[PDB]
Each structure stands twice: as structure tokens, then as C-alpha cells.
Design a protein around this ligand. Sequence first.
Ligand code: HEC
Ligand code: HEC
Ligand SMILES: O=C1O[C@H]([C@@H](O)CO)C(O)=C1O
Ligand SMILES: O=C1O[C@H]([C@@H](O)CO)C(O)=C1O
Ligand SMILES: O=C1O[C@H]([C@@H](O)CO)C(O)=C1O
Ligand SMILES: O=C1O[C@H]([C@@H](O)CO)C(O)=C1O
Ligand SMILES: O=C1O[C@H]([C@@H](O)CO)C(O)=C1O
Ligand SMILES: O=C1O[C@H]([C@@H](O)CO)C(O)=C1O
Lengths: 134, 134
Amino acid sequence: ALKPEDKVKFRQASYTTMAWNMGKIKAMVVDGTMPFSQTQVSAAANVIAAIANSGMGALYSPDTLGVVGFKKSRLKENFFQEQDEVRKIATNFVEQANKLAEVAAMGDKDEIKAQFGEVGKACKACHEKFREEE
Amino acid sequence: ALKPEDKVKFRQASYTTMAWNMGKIKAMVVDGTMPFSQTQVSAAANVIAAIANSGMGALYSPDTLGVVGFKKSRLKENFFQEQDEVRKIATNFVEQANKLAEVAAMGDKDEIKAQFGEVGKACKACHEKFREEE
Ligand code: HEC
Ligand code: HEC
Ligand SMILES: O=C1O[C@H]([C@@H](O)CO)C(O)=C1O
Ligand SMILES: O=C1O[C@H]([C@@H](O)CO)C(O)=C1O
Ligand SMILES: O=C1O[C@H]([C@@H](O)CO)C(O)=C1O
Ligand SMILES: O=C1O[C@H]([C@@H](O)CO)C(O)=C1O
Ligand SMILES: O=C1O[C@H]([C@@H](O)CO)C(O)=C1O
Ligand SMILES: O=C1O[C@H]([C@@H](O)CO)C(O)=C1O
């Protein structure tokens, strides 16, 4: 199976990959710091949905607490104490990510901006709660 | 725009995310060390295709040579000298990744194994050529 170090690397890599693709959508539909491209915004949305559906629950186990992947894990132990809250936030994130990829395929900038805002809220719902602040 | 350090982190994260998802397909259709799941193999294929289509060419510029992302970049300078060879290998990889996601949606283990083998060859075609060995 996967060593703890690999579980942490693979989840840090997955989240960092989503963050690159989230920044590209933000640049094109929120900040206008990149030209709007239907192809590029859809491609970025599709990465977020695919990773959201990739079964990242397999990368979460107690033996990953405090373990270095690319860097020391920022997972808080309360993740293992609050499984009802984790299920609520995770299922919400998958639903919002799926919707973003659906909207971004042919949606206009304002439709995408609305769906993107719901995904951003879903990402943020793990902050301070399950991820150590920095 | 993106600092060199961010370009290296985002490309290292993208490749590591594909490697996690490639390992899951290998376990289910090549080594039989994980139970075959149509849902899970399709989800893993969809991550690889989505990242392959994510425009990772934006993360490649000469000012990323020798720069630390998660770790010091393993990009070789000959990437910038061999753009015809890079275009051949990159377009091949996108084509094979798209085909893997198409096959993995309803394909059987042997169909997926064949498409997965073509993607593995496409990943390997950047080795020693554009990525430093270790
Ligand atoms: C809880 C169910 C989460 C959801 C939904 C998202 N993230 Fe997250 N993120 C979470 C944890 C517990 C951690 C720490 C991982 C570790 O082991 O250290 C993170 C981390 C990140 C990071 C930093 C990654 C790194 O290289 O170290 C980023 C950039 C990040 N997360 C972004 C992010 C985005 C963009 C999300 C929505 C698309 C998202 N996360 C969801 C917990 C959760
Ligand atoms: C050339 C067009 C590439 C293709 C196609 C793939 N990879 Fe690759 N990979 C490449 C470079 C130039 C590098 C170095 C990146 C850097 O800046 O250091 C890599 C790196 C990886 C890594 C290590 C990532 C890390 O955390 O440091 C892995 C695990 C990796 N690559 C895997 C991989 C897979 C599975 C691919 C096909 C699905 C794949 N790569 C394609 C160049 C190229
Ligand atoms: O590191 C971070 O991860 C999340 C996500 O938004 C990534 O962009 C966040 O809010 C950060 O500053
Ligand atoms: O606007 C954004 O919100 C998401 C989310 O991660 C918020 O934390 C993200 O990374 C963006 O670019
Ligand atoms: O790295 C960060 O730490 C805090 C917190 O959200 C982490 O959970 C924050 O807002 C960041 O961007
Ligand atoms: O680090 C590696 O990256 C490629 C890829 O196969 C990832 O699994 C490879 O062959 C490695 O050992
Ligand atoms: O069998 C595999 O091949 C790919 C490719 O990266 C080969 O280098 C990979 O990572 C696998 O699990
Ligand atoms: O890390 C590795 O270095 C060599 C080379 O392929 C890198 O380009 C190899 O086969 C690995 O798995």
C-alpha cells in the first residue's frame, strides 16, 4: 500500500494542482487579469472536478499526522474527531466542483463566476477547522 | 503573473497528482493488487486527461531552470533546444491521456490495460531527455 509520506505528498500535490487551476479561473472570471477563454476555463474546471472525484479519502489516515510529504502535514487531528462535519464539507465540495465543470463547459463569465464562488467557499470550509493556519 | 518558484511547484504537483492516479490504474488493471472498480479506474483516468489538457506549457520558461518548487527543478535545459521533439512528445501524451479516459469510462480491464500502456510510454518519453535522472 502507500507509506504515510506518499499519502501526504499525493494529497498536498492534489490540493496544489487544484489551486493552480482555481487561480486561472479567478484570473479570467473575477479579476479580469487574463483574457476569458472558454477552452481554458473549462479545462481548469475539469481538473478541479476530476481531483474532487479522485477518492482523496484514501490519503487520510491517523498515521499521516505530523508526517512530511513535500513539507510537514498541516492536517489537524480534529479531522478524525469530526467525521460528520468532514462528510458534510467533502460531499458539498464534490457537488460544487461537479457543478463548476458543468457550468464552465459552455457557460458565460457571470454563470461561471457564481459557480466558482461556491467552490471557493467549499475549499475555505476546511480552513482553521481541519488545516493548520500559516 | 506566476513567480518561477510557483511554476515549478505547480508542475511538480501536477505530475505527482498524475502519478498517484496512474498507480491506482496500474494496481487495478496490471498488477491486480487492488479490486477492479469501473468508477475508481474512470475517476483516476479522468484526473490524468484533465491535467494533460490543463495547459502545463504555461509552467515552462527558462527562468524556472534550477529553481526550487517543492524541491529543485529536474527540468533539463535541452527542453528549450528541442522544441520539435517536445511538441511531438506533448501532443502524443494529450492524445493517449484522452484515449485512456474514453476507454476507462465503460471499457473492460484488458481494453484499459492497452490504453494505460500507451499513456505510460508517453510519460516515459520525457525521461533522461527532458527530466534529470535520480
Ligand atoms: C477538507 C475536506 C478539504 C477540502 C474540501 C479542500 N482542502 Fe485544501 N487542504 C486540506 C488539508 C487538510 C490540507 C493539508 C494537507 C497536508 O497534508 O498538508 C490542505 C492543503 C491545501 C494546500 C497546500 C498544499 C501543499 O502543497 O502543502 C492548498 C493550496 C489547498 N489545500 C487548496 C485547496 C483548494 C484550492 C481547494 C478547493 C478547490 C481545497 N484546498 C479543498 C483540506 C481541504
Ligand atoms: C514532458 C512533456 C513530460 C510528460 C509528458 C510527463 N512528464 Fe513527468 N516530468 C517532466 C519534467 C520535465 C519533470 C520535472 C519537473 C520539475 O520541475 O522538477 C517531471 C516530473 C515528474 C515527477 C516528479 C514530480 C515531483 O514531485 O517533483 C513525477 C512523479 C512525474 N513527472 C510523473 C509523470 C507521469 C505519471 C506522467 C504521465 C501521466 C508524466 N510525468 C508525463 C516531464 C514530463
Ligand atoms: O494555501 C492556501 O490554500 C487555500 C486555497 O485557496 C489555495 O489557493 C488558501 O485559501 C490558501 O492561501
Ligand atoms: O478564489 C479562490 O478561492 C479558492 C479557494 O481555495 C478559497 O480558499 C481559490 O484557491 C481561489 O483562487
Ligand atoms: O495558509 C493559510 O493559513 C490560513 C488558514 O486558512 C489555513 O487553514 C489561511 O487562511 C491561509 O492561506
Ligand atoms: O518519479 C517518477 O516519475 C515517473 C512516473 O512514472 C511517476 O510514477 C517515473 O517513471 C518515476 O519513477
Ligand atoms: O505504469 C506506469 O507507467 C506510468 C508512467 O509514468 C511511466 O513512467 C506510471 O506512473 C505508472 O504507474
Ligand atoms: O527518478 C527517476 O530518474 C530516472 C529518469 O527516468 C528521470 O528522468 C528514472 O527512471 C526515475 O524514476
